Amino acid sequence: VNSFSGYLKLTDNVYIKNADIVEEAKKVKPTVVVNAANVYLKHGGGVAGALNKATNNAMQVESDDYIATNGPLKVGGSCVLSGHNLAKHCLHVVGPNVNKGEDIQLLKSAYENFNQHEVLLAPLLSAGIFGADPIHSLRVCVDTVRTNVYLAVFDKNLYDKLVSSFLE
Numbered sequence: 001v002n003s004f005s006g007y008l009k010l011t012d013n014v015y016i017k018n019a020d021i022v023e024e025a026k027k028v029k030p031t032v033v034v035n036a037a038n039v040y041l042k043h044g045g046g047v048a049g050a051l052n053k054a055t056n057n058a059m060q061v062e063s064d065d066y067i068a069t070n071g072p073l074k075v076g077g078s079c080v081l082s083g084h085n086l087a088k089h090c091l092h093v094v095g096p097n098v099n100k101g102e103d104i105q106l107l108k109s110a111y112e113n114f115n116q117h118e119v120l121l122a123p124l125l126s127a128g129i130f131g132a133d134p135i136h137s138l139r140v141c142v143d144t145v146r147t148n149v150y151l152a153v154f155d156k157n158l159y160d161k162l163v164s165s166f167l168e
């Protein structure tokens with residue numbers, strides 16, 4: 001049903017909210033929730049861990065089965081799997097891990113995957129353990145994505161910095 005509420009317009013197609021993406025997916029019933037995935041689809045922490053836990057491990061069983069056919073994803077790549085109870089689809093997207101020397105230029109390729117979907121509920125890619133600057137990631141999102149993306153940012157302090165950087 002894509003019932004997004006309380007999102008701040010940043011640009012004509014990019015919205016942002018200070019919110020837990022798992023609680024957002026349960027209220028919104030989005031067509032697509034984006035996962036911040038790794039190449040092996042092992043959902044052991046962060047957004048990936050949170051989404052998988054909310055599916056009581058359904059997501060992780062489908063993920064393996066996909067890996068069995070494909071082997072690992074490529075950095076900047078993605079796959080469309082079931083959203084289970086959270087969404088119609090989950091778009092598993094791998095951004096570069098700059099801690100491991102993966103190139104920040106691949107963050108554009110990662111966001112390009114969003115353009116295959118009319119409307120997404122998403123985190124910022126390559127943030128957290130992936131080591132990119134979240135404000136940089138928001139700029140790449142705004143520059144690259146032309147479809148409608150509703151970004152959920154868990155941390156109030158980071159949310160306020162993002163909105164300060166974008167609108168002041």
Ligand SMILES: Cc1ccc2c(C(=O)O)c[nH]c2c1
Binds near residue numbers: 029083
């Ligand atoms: C959890 C869930 C399941 C299905 C859908 C859907 C659809 O089937 O069109 C749109 N949002 C959804 C959300």
